[PDB]
Design a protein around this ligand. Structure first.
Ligand code: FAD
Ligand SMILES: *[C@@H]1O[C@H](CO)[C@@H](O[C@@H]2O[C@H](CO)[C@@H](O)[C@H](O)[C@H]2NC(C)=O)[C@H](O)[C@H]1NC(C)=O
Ligand code: NAG
Ligand code: NAG
Length: 548
């Protein structure tokens, strides 16, 4: 059995879709890609100047793009079907985009869409922001549950349970980083969220784990979830906590989005705000030569433990001849910032390097975040659609023998132009209180999460971009894996073609994750590439989803 596609005898009629729309109170949207304004047909609405506006920031994570119902940010998944950078005469086609989008207002819209889809054998897709690097928030011929507009927030002053007492926030499924930060800040709190401000904090970010510059202080985003409000495949409106539907709670808190249930909201721990120490710390090989530069990168890595165990973090960009780091030091006044940086600066001084060091103390976390990752509120985060990753164990770094292999990996990757420079985050998320969840164990032993990320080139041919896609999956990622035994790959930052996904994403947790999948979705209504239980479905040459 296969899901239906447009053209099939069993594709729902115009009356069937109109019936669904009536049930949804007019909230069904026939998908019109945002870049239809760049083409004359089949939508008649070529607007040359509106098209130039889309070109200007198409490869950036913009609120304008995220606001579009049927769109996705990945240039690879757009796949030239309806894009700004082909000729106006080339027809705008849906390709990987869903055929219809449900503008979800609450639980009933989801229940009605699920029931319709099971009745008519339509593929369900779930999309929040369209950030997903693996194409998991789009799909050909699908009915998409668009969660973007569930923006409600609610401060809970005294959340009270065995697992947590303190302030919390209930956030709707569509709440993005910038909105969560604005809400948390308004009450003098912080929340654990991603570095890219348009990222959907309640969607794939937290559901897949979600690292943060506050992770050394408060753990992974998944660690901070108190409750998940969901709709199951069979339409049940449930709440999953550590003591209620707790197997579902466990799976949702790190098991990856788009497979266990449809999330309507989450409730997450808030944390007391206060001053935040910051710095730019940068150095290069210009005075001292490339070999010493790499020895300095290696020693920088080996000095991180004490810094990270104090609740602090570095997010840094590793280039072939220079490194630029951004330090986050919660509650560190100026004297304390200098004391925390001193070992790093003493080491660089002993190798002949004069670094660029620009410390600061921000009054609150919101200001700190947007000093380095702004401008507020939306940032300017570039979308690199060949994103790979590795969670690297501390033990690899602290043993200078295995750390030499790590440095050799970084040097090798630094020599590949499309994937260089690249960002790394650093964290210690062991030994903190959290409810039991399905985060890969590698997170706990982990110290670095590095994301070599290939850019898209609109002047290249489709075959060249396909070849880069394949290179990332079958050459670069396995090279990263072999250099970092004991690590894992972060399921949110990987290539859709990566063959070893099951082992690297889920490891020993897969058995239990799969039992939760089969319990809450026995008919496999939910599918995402590399998702738990995704092996039930296969995509054929046409993009049709068929049972394996
Ligand atoms: C684009 C981008 C992504 C980033 C950036 N920075 C990050 C960082 O500093 N740390 C991180 O840990 N991650 C970073 N990410 C990655 C994002 O965390 C992931 O790409 C998330 O998977 C994206 O989440 P979301 O914003 O929800 O994007 P979608 O593509 O809409 O969905 C992803 C995935 O999750 C499922 N899903 C979303 N919402 C739901 C609900 N309500 N219910 C069920 N399932 C849901 C989707 O089906 C899909 O599979 C920096 C940048 C620039
Ligand atoms: C972009 O579209 C092309 C087809 O126009 C897709 O090519 C298919 O790729 C798969 C492997 O992923 C092959 O096994 C199929 O034979 C190809 N199909 C055809 C018809 O050539 C390609 O997958 C699309 N890219 C993305 C990222 O969706
Ligand atoms: C659903 O109904 C609304 C309100 O009349 C309409 O604007 C919209 O175009 C309809 N959607 C579809 C897919 O027909
Ligand atoms: C989605 O629904 C909300 C609330 O009903 C509405 O404000 C918004 O304009 C809708 N979006 C689109 C694109 O129709």
């Amino acid at each position: 059995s296969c899901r239906v596609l447009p053209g099939d005898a069993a594709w729902p009629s115009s009356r069937d879709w109109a019936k669904l729309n009536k049930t949804l109170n007019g909230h069904l949207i026939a998908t019109v890609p945002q870049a239809s304004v760049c083409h004359k047909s089949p939508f008649g609405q070529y607007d040359a100047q509106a098209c130039e506006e889309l070109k200007s920031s198409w490869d950036i994570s913009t609120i304008t793009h995220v606001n579009a119902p049927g769109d996705v940010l990945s240039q690879n998944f757009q796949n030239y079907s309806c894009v700004p950078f082909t000729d106006p005469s080339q027809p705008c086609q849906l390709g990987n985009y869903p055929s219809y989008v449900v503008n979800v207002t609450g639980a009933a819209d989801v229940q009605a869409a699920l029931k319709f889809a099971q009745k008519h054998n339509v593929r369900i897709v779930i999309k929040n922001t369209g950030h997903d690097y693996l194409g998991k928030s789009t799909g050909k011929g699908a009915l998409s549950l668009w969660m973007h507009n569930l923006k409600s927030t609610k401060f809970i002053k005294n959340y009270k349970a065995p697992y947590y007492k303190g302030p919390a926030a209930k956030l709707g499924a569509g709440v993005e980083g910038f909105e969560a930060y604005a809400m948390a800040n308004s009450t003098g709190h912080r929340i654990v969220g991603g570095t890219c401000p348009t990222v959907g904090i309640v969607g794939g970010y937290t559901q897949g784990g979600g690292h943060s510059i506050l992770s050394s202080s408060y753990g992974v985003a998944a660690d901070n979830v108190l409750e998940w409000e969901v709709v199951t495949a069979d339409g049940r409106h449930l709440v999953a906590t550590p003591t209620r539907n707790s197997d579902l709670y466990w799976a949702l808190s790190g098991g990856g989005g788009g497979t266990f249930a449809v999330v309507l909201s989450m409730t997450a721990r808030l944390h007391r705000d206060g001053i935040v120490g910051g710095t730019l710390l940068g150095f290069n090989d210009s005075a001292v030569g490339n070999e010493v530069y790499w020895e300095a990168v290696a020693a920088f890595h080996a000095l991180l433990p004490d810094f990270l165990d104090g609740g602090n973090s570095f997010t840094y960009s590793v280039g072939n001849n220079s490194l630029t780091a951004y330090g986050t030091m919660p509650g560190a006044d100026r004297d304390a910032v200098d004391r925390l940086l001193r070992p790093f600066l003493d080491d660089l001084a002993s190798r002949g390097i004069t670094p660029v060091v620009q410390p600061r103390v921000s009054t609150n976390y919101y200001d700190h975040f947007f000093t380095y990752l702004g401008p507020a509120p939306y940032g300017n985060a570039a979308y690199f659609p060949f994103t790979n990753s590795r969670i690297i164990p501390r033990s690899l770094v602290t043993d200078p023998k295995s750390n030499a292999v790590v440095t050799d990996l970084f040097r090798n990757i630094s020599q590949v132009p499309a994937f260089s420079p690249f960002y790394c985050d650093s964290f210690s998320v062991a030994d903190k209180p959290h409810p039991a969840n399905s985060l890969h164990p590698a997170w706990r032993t982990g110290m670095l999460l590095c994301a070599p990320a290939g850019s898209w080139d609109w002047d290249a041919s489709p075959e060249e971009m396909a070849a880069r896609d394949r290179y990332a999956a079958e050459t670069l990622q396995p090279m990263m894996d072999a250099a970092t035994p004991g690590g894992s790959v972060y399921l949110n930052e990987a290539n859709h073609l990566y063959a070893n996904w099951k082992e690297s994403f889920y490891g020993d947790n897969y058995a239990r994750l799969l039992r939760v999948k089969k319990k809450y979705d026995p008919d496999s209504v939910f599918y995402v590439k590399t998702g738990v239980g995704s092996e039930v479905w296969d995509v054929d040459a046409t993009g049709r989803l068929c049972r394996a």
